[PDB]
Coordinates of C-alpha atoms and ligand atoms in Angstrom, one line a residue:
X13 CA 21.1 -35.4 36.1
X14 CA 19.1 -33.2 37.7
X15 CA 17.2 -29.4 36.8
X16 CA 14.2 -28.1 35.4
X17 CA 13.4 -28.0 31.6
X18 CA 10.8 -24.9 30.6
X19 CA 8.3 -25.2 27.2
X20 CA 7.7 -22.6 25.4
X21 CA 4.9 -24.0 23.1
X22 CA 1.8 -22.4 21.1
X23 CA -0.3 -23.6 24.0
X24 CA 0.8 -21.5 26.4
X25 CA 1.4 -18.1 24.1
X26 CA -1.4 -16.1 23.8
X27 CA -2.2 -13.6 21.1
X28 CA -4.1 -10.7 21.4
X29 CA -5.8 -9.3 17.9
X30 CA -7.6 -5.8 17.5
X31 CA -9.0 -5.0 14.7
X32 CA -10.4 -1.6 13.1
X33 CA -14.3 -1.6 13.6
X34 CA -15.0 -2.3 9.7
X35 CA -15.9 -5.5 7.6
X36 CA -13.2 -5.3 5.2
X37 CA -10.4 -4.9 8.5
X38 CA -12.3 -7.0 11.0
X39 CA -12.3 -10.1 8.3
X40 CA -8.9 -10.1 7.5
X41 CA -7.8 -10.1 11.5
X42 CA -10.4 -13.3 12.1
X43 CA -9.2 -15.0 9.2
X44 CA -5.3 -14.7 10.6
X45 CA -7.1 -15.6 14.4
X46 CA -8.5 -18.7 12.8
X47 CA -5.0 -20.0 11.3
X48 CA -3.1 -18.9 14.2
X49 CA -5.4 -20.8 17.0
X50 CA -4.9 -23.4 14.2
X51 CA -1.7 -24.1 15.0
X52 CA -2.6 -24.2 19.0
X53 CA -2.3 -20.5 19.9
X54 CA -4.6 -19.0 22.7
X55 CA -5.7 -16.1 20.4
X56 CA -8.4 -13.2 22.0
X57 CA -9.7 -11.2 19.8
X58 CA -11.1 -7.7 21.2
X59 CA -14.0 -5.7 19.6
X60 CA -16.2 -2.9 19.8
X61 CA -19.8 -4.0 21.3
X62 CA -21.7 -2.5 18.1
X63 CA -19.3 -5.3 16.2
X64 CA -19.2 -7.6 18.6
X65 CA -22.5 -9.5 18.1
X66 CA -21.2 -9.6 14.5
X67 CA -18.0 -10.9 15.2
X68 CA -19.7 -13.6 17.5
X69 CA -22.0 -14.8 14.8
X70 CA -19.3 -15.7 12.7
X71 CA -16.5 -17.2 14.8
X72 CA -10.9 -18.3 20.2
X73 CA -11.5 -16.0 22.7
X74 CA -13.8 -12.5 22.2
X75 CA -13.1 -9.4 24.4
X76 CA -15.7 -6.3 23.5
X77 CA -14.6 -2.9 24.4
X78 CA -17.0 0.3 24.3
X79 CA -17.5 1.7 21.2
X80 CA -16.0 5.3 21.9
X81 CA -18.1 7.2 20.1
X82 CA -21.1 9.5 20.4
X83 CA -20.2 13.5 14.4
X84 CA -18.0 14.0 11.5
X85 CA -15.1 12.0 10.6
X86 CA -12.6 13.5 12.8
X87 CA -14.1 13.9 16.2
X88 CA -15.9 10.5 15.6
X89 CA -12.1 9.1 14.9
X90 CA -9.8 11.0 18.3
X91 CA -12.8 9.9 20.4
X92 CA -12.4 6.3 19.4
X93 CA -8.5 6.8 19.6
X94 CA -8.5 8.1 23.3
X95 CA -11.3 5.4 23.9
X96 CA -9.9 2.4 22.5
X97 CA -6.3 3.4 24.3
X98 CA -7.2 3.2 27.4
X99 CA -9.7 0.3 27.0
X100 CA -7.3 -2.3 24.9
X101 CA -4.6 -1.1 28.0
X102 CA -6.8 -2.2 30.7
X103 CA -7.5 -5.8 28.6
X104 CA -4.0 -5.9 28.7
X105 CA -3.2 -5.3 32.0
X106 CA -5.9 -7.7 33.2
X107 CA -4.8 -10.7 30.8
X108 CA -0.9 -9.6 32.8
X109 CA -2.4 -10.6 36.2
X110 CA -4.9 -13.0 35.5
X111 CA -4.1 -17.0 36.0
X112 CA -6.2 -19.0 33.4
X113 CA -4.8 -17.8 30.3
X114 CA -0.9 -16.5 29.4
X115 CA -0.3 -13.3 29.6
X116 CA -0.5 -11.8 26.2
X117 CA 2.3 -12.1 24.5
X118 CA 1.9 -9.7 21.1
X119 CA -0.8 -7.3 19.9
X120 CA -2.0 -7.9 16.9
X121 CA -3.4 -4.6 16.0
X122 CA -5.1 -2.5 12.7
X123 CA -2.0 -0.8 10.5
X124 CA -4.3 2.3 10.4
X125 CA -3.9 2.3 14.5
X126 CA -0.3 3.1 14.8
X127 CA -0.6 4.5 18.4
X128 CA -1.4 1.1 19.6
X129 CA 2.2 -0.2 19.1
X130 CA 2.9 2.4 22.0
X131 CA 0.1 0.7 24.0
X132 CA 1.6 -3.0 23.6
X133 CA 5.7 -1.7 23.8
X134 CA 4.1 0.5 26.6
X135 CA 2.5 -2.5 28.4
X136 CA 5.8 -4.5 27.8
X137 CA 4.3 -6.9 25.2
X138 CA 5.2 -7.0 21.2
X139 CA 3.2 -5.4 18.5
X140 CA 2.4 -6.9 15.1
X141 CA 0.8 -4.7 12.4
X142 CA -1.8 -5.9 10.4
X143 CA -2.1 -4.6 7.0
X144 CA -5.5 -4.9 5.3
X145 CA -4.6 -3.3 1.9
X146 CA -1.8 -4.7 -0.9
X147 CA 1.7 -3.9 -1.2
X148 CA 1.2 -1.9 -4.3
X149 CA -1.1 1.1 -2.7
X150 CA 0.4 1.4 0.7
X151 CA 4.3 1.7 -0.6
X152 CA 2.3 5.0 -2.6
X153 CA 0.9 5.8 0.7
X154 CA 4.1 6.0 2.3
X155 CA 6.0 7.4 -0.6
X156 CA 3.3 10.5 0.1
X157 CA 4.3 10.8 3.5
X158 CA 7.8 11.1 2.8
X159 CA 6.2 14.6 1.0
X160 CA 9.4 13.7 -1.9
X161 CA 7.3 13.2 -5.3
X162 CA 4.5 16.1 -5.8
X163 CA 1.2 14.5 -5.6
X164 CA -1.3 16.9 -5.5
X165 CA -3.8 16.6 -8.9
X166 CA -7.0 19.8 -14.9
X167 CA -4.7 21.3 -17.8
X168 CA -2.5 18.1 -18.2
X169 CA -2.2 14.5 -17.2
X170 CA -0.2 13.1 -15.0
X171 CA 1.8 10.0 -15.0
X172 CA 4.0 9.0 -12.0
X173 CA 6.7 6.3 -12.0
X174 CA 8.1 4.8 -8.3
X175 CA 10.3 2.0 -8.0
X176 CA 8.8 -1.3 -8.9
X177 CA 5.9 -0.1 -9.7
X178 CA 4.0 0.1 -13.1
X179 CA 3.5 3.7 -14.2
X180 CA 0.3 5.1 -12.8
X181 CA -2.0 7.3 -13.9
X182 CA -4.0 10.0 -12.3
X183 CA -6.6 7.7 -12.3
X184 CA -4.8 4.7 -11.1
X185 CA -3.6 6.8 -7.5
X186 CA -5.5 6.1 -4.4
X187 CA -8.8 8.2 -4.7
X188 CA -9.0 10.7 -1.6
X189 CA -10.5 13.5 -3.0
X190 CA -14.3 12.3 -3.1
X191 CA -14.0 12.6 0.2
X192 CA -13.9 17.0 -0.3
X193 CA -13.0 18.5 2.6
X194 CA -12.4 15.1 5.1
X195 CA -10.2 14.2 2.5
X196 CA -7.6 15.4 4.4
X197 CA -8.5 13.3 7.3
X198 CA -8.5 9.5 5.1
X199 CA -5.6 11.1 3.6
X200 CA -3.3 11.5 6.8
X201 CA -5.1 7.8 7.9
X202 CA -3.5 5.8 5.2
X203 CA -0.5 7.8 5.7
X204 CA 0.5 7.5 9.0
X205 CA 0.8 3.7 9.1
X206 CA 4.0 4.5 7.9
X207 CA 4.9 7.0 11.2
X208 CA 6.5 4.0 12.7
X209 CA 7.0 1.1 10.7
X210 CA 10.6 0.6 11.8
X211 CA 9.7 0.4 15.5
X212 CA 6.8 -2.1 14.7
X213 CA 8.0 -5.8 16.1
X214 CA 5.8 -7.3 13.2
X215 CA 5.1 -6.1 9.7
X216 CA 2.0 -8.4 8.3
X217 CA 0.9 -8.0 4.8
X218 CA -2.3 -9.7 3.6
X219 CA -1.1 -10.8 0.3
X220 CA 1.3 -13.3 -1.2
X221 CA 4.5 -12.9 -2.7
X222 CA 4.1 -14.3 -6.0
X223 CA 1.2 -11.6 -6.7
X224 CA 3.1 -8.6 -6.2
X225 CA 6.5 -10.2 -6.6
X226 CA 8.8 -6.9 -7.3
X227 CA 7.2 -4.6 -4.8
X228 CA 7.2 -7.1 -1.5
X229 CA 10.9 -7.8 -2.5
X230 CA 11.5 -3.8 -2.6
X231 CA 9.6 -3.4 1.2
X232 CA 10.8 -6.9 2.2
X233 CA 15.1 -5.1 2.1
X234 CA 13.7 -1.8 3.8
X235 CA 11.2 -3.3 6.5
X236 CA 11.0 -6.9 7.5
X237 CA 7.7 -7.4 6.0
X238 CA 6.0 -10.8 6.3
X239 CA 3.3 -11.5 3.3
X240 CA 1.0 -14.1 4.8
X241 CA -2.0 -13.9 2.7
X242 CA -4.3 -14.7 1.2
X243 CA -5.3 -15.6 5.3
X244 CA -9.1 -16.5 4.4
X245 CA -9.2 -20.3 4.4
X246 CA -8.8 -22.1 1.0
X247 CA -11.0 -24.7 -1.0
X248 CA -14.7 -20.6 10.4
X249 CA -16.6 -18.0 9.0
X250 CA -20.4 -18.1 9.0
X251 CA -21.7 -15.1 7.0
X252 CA -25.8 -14.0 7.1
X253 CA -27.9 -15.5 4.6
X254 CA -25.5 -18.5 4.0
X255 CA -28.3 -21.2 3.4
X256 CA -30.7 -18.7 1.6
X257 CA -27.9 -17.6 -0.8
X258 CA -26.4 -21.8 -1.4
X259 CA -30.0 -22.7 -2.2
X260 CA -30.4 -20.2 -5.3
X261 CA -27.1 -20.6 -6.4
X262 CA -27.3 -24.3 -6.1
X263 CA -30.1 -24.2 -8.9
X264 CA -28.5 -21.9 -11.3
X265 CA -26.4 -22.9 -14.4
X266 CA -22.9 -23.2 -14.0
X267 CA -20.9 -20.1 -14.9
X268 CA -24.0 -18.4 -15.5
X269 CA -24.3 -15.6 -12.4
X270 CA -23.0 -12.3 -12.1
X271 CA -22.1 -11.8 -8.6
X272 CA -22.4 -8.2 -7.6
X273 CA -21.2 -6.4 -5.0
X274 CA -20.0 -2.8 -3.5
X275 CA -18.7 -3.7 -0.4
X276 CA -19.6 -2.9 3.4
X277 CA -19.4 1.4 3.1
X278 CA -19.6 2.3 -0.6
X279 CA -22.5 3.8 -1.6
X280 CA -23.5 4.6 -4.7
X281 CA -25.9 7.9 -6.5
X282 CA -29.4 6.7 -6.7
X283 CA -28.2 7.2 -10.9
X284 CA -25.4 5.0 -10.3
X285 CA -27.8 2.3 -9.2
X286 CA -30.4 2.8 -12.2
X287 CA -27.7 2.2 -14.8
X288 CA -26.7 -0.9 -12.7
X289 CA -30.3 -2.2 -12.9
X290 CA -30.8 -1.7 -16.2
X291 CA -27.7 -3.6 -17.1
X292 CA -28.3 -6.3 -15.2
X293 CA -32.1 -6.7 -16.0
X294 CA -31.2 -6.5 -19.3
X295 CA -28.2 -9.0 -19.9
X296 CA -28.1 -12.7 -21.1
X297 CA -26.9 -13.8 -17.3
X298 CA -28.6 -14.6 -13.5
X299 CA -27.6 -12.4 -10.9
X300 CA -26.8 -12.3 -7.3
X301 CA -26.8 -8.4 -6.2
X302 CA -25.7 -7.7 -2.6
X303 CA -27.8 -4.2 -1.7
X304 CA -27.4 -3.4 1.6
X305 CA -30.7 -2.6 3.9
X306 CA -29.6 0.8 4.3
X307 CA -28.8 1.1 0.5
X308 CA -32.3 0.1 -0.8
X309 CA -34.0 3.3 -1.2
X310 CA -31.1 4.5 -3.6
X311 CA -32.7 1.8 -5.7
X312 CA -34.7 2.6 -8.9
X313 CA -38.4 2.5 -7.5
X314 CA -39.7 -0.1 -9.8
X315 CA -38.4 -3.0 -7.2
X316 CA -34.6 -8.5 2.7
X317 CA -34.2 -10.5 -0.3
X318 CA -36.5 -10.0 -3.7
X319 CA -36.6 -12.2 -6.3
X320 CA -36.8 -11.5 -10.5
X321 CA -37.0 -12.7 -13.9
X322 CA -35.4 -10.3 -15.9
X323 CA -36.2 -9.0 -19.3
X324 CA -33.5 -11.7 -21.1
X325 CA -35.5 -14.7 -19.2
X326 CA -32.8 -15.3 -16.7
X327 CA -33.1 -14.7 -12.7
X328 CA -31.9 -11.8 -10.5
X329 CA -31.9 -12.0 -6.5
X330 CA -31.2 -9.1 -4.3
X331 CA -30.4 -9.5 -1.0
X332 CA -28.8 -7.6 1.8
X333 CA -26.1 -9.8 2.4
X334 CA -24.2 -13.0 1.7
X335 CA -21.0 -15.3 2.2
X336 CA -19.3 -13.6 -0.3
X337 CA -16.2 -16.3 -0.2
X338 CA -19.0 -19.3 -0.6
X339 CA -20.2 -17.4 -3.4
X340 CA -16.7 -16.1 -5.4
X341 CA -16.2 -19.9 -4.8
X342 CA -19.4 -21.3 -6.1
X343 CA -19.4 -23.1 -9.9
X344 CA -22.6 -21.5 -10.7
X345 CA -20.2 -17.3 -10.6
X346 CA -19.4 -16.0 -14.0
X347 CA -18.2 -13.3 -12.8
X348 CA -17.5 -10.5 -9.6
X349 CA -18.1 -6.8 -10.3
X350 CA -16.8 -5.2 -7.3
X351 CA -15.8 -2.3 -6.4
X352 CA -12.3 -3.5 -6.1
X353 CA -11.9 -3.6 -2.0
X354 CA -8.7 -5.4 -1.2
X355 CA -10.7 -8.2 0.4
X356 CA -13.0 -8.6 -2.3
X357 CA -9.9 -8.4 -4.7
X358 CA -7.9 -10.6 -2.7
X359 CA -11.0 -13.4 -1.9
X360 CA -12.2 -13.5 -5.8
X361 CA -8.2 -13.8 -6.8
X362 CA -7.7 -17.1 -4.3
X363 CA -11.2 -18.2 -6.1
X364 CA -10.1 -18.0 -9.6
X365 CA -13.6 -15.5 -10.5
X366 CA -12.5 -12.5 -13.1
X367 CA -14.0 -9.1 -12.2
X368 CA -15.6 -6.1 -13.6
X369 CA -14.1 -3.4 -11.7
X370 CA -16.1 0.0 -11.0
X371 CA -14.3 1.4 -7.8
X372 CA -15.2 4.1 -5.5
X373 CA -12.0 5.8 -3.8
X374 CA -8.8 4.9 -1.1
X375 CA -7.0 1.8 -2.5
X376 CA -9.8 0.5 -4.8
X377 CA -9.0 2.7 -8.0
X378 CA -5.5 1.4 -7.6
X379 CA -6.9 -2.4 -7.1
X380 CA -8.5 -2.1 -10.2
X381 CA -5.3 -1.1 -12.2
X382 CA -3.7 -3.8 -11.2
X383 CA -6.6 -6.0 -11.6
X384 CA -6.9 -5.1 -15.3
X385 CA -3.5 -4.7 -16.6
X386 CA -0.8 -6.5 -14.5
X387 CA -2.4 -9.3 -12.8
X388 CA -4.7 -9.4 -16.3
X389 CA -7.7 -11.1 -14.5
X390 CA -10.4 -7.9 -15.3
X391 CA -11.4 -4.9 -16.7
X392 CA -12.4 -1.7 -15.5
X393 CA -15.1 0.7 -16.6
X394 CA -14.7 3.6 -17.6
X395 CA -16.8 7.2 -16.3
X396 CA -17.0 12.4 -18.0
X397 CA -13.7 10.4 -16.8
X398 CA -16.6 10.3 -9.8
X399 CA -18.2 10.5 -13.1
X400 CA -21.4 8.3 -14.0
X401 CA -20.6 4.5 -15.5
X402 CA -23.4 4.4 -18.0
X403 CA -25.3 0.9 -18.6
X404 CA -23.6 0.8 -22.2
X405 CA -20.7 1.1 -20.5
X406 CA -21.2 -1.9 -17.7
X407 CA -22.8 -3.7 -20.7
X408 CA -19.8 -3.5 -23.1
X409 CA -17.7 -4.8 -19.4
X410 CA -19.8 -8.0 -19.1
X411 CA -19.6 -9.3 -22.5
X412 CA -16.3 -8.5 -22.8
X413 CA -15.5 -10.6 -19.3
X414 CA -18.0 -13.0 -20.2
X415 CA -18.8 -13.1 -23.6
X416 CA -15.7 -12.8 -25.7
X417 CA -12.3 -14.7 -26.1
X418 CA -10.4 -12.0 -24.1
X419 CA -13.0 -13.2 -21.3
X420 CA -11.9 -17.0 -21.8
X421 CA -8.5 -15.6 -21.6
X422 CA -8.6 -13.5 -18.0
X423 CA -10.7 -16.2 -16.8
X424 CA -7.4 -18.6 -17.3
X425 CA -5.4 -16.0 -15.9
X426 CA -7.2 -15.9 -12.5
X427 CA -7.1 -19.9 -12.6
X428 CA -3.4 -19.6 -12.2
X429 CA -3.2 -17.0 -10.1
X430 CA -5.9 -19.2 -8.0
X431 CA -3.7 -21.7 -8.0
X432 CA -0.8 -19.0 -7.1
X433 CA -2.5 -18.0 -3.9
X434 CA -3.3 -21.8 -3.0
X435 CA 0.2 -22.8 -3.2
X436 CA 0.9 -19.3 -1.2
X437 CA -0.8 -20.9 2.0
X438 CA -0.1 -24.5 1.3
X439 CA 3.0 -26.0 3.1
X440 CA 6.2 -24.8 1.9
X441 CA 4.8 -22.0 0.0
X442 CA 5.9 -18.3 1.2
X443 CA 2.6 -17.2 3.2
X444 CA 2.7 -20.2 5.2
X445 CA 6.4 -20.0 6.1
X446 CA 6.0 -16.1 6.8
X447 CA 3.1 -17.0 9.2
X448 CA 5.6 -20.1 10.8
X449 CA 8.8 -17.0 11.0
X450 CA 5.6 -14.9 12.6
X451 CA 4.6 -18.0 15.3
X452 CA 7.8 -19.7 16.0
X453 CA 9.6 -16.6 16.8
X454 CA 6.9 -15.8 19.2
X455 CA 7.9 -18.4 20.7
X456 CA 11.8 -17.7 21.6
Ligands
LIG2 O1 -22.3 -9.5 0.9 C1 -21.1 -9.3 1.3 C2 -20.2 -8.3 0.9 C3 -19.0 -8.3 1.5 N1 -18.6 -9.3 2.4 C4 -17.2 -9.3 2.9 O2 -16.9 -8.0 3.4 C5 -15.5 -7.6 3.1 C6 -15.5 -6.4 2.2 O3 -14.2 -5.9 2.3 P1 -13.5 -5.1 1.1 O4 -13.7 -5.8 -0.1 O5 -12.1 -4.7 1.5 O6 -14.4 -3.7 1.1 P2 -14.8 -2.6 2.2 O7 -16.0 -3.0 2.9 O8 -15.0 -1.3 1.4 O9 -13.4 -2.4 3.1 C7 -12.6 -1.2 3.4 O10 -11.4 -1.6 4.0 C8 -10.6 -2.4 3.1 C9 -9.4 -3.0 3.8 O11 -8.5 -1.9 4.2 C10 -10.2 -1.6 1.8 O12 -9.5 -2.4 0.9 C11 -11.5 -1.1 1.2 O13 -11.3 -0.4 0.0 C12 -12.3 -0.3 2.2 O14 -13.5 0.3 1.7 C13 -14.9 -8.9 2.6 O15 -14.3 -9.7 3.6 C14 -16.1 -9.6 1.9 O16 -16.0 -11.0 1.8 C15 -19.4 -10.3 2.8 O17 -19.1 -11.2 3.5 N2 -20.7 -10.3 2.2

């Protein structure tokens, strides 16, 4: 008969998001921003001012902070943690007082900031971990934290065998040691997103559960992890050299290009690149080959964007950039070699594109043995077994991805994994009722 009924509602929750200062964590946190103001959140995302003109290009609400850094690794890294701290505090504490929006609600921030779930429990607010790397290679990051199995790694090989995992070679562990003597530093990094996963509010995982099936069930009983991936959009983002990189595609054969490309930070030997060149001037397919502007002098000097006929009659372009998800999704893609990031992984599996897999270090050496051998939708090259992957050798990986029945074959296996990571995201399936457990518990 009379009283006062209070809404809780999307609406009026808002999200903060803070992402690590890299492509391949920034993307991944935008992606998740998109879906969630999708279903009516306020959502700000914050951002260093060296990414922020980025991050505005492509895109919800956009906070910069100061970049916190003026330098190896490690002094580059606790001046950016002492930095960002403070900074993402006082964003906090002014979204608490302010009027127009909610007061935030839940930090969503980077897995490999673990500190910040002390800023957002310290500011009274929940934290929400974000997770930019599979299930597979971060249950062996925290299995080396726990300091139980021996993993330090030339007078025999190892193999090593942890629950629900395949057995993994030397090879197959997450590569830390090209690093030399900061490998300490990306060591203790991946690690210690484990320091206090059973204090974190929210445990997101960007993958789906039908991909890694026996290892998210294994985390899923010891922490509440929530698998929401694949969170890029399926068949916005607006990447550099969109129309420039639709046009040549648009006039290419279908399933006739090579896509090519080593990430946002790999870089490869000035060798390393010749042998790429060679194979891909040499074989019976068009290429796309992302070099970055900083990368171009490591190229072989016979070559923003250059265009070639190669020496089989077919076309080449190389360009400092692209929309890599337009492209992995684009009819005229043969094929991705890629140097197996978890993105890159992750955007060519929910695009149904089989890879040739040459990866660098961290997670991407473990990517690829799961890309080859238990997913089945690749192969990887082989090295002296760091070692130089000869042009014979990145030759003898195209036709066998594109040229042979075993390519037919992985080629139907990333179809129905495509298909997998669709029906992941799609009503009903288990990344969209993670993300609905993750927005409608906000609101309670
Ligand atoms: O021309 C390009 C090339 C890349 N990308 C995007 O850039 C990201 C690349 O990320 P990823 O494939 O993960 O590679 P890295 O840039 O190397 O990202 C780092 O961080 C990832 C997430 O933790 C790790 O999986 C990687 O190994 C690590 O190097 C993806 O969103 C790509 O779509 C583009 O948009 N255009």
């Amino acid at each position: 008969h009379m009283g006062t009924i209070e809404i809780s509602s999307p609406s009026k929750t808002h999200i903060l998001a803070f992402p690590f200062p890299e492509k391949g964590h920034i993307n991944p946190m935008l992606h998740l921003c998109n879906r969630l103001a999708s279903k009516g959140f306020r959502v700000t995302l914050i951002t260093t001012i060296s990414t922020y003109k980025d991050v505005k290009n492509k895109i919800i609400n956009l906070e910069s902070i100061p970049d916190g850094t003026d330098l190896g690794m490690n002094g580059y890294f606790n001046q950016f943690k002492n930095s960002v701290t403070e900074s993402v505090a006082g964003i906090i504490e002014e979204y608490k007082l302010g009027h127009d929006f909610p007061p935030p609600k839940v930090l969503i921030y980077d897995s490999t900031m673990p500190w910040m779930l002390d800023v957002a429990h310290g500011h009274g607010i929940l934290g929400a971990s974000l997770f930019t790397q599979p299930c597979c290679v971060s249950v062996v990051y925290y299995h080396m934290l726990q300091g139980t199995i021996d993993f330090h790694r030339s007078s025999s090989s190892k193999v090593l065998l942890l629950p629900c995992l395949p057995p993994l070679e030397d090879r197959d562990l997450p590569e830390f040691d090209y690093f030399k003597e900061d490998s300490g530093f990306v060591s203790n990094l991946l690690l210690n997103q484990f320091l206090n996963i059973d204090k974190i509010d929210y445990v997101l995982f960007n993958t789906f559960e039908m991909l890694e099936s026996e290892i998210a069930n294994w985390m899923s009983n010891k922490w509440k992890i929530l698998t929401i991936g694949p969170t890029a959009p399926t068949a916005y983002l607006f990447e550099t050299n969109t129309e420039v990189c639709m046009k040549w595609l648009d006039e290419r054969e279908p399933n006739s290009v090579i896509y090519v490309s080593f990430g946002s930070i790999a870089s490869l030997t000035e060798q390393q690149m010749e042998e790429i060149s060679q194979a891909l001037f040499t074989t019976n397919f068009n290429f796309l080959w992302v070099v970055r502007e900083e990368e171009r002098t490591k190229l072989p000097n016979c070559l923003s964007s250059e265009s070639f006929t190669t020496a089989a009659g077919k076309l080449g372009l190389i360009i400092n950039w692209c929309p890599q998800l337009d492209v992995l999704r684009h009819e005229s893609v043969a094929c991705f070699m890629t140097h197996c990031g978890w993105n890159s992984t992750l955007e060519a599996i929910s695009s149904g594109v089989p890879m040739i897999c040459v990866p660098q270090w961290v997670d991407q050496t473990t990517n690829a043995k799961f890309i080859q051998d238990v997913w089945k939708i690749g192969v990887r090259v082989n090295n002296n077994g760091g070692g130089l992957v000869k042009k014979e050798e990145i030759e003898r990986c195209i036709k066998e991805v594109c040229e042979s029945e075993k390519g037919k074959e992985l080629k139907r296996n990333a179809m129905k994994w495509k298909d997998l990571s669709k029906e992941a995201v799609s009503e009903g399936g288990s990344s969209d009722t993670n993300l609905e457990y993750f927005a409608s518990t906000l609101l309670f």
